[PDB]
Amino acid sequence: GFEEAITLEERAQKSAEAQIMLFQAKRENVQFQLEAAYRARLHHVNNEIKKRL
Amino acid sequence: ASKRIARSSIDWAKMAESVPESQKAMYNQFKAKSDGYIRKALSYPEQPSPINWEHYRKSLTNPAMVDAFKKQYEALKVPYPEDKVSSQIDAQEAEAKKEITKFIQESRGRIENYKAELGKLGQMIPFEHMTLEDFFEAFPEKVLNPDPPSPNVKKKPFKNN
Incomplete structure (x- = not known):
């Protein structure tokens, strides 16, 4: 039981490290969403110009 | 471009090695909802279709409108x-x-x-x-x-008792 408790504390520390990975993935996902919205507005502008032509 | 939209991601392999399933079931949402931001990232490139101005010059008697629209398109750049x-x-x-x-x-x-x-x-x-x-x-x-x-x-x- 003592050895299993030690290994579970190690797993908890690894969970904290993967929480840091989660926050980095969160800010990456926000940048991905913002860039994708920029691509859509570029597409909308190009589609309108093609419609005028 | 398509650098930080189409051809990039975050390594989920080390993410799944810590989450205690029912404790962090929102990861099943996080891997899925962000995948939605990957699915729209499958669409939406920078330039979806370049404009063949030569084709419009050949298809129009007066090509001055084509040159004016090309100049207006080059004069406008959308930033981030x-x-x-x-x-x-x-x-x-x-x-x-x-x-x-x-x-x-x-x-x-x-x-x-x-x-x-x-x-x-x-x-x-x-x-x-x-x-x-x-x-x-x-x-x-x-x-x-x-x-x-x-x-x-x-x-x-x-x-x-």
């Missing part, structure tokens, strides 16, 4: 959208760092306690050579005069 969530994410990251530091400190204290208990139990005298007082020294529950008594001093002969 504004951001106001960066400070919020940095604040969440700082709060996460403080909570992780606190949790690591608590884990260090619990590890030290468990190692002390394991060392104490390793250093105990074996039960074959243990007198009935060395057992009561290593297990200080004992049986005392101001204690709930019984002729069979057991774990359930008193109270429980």
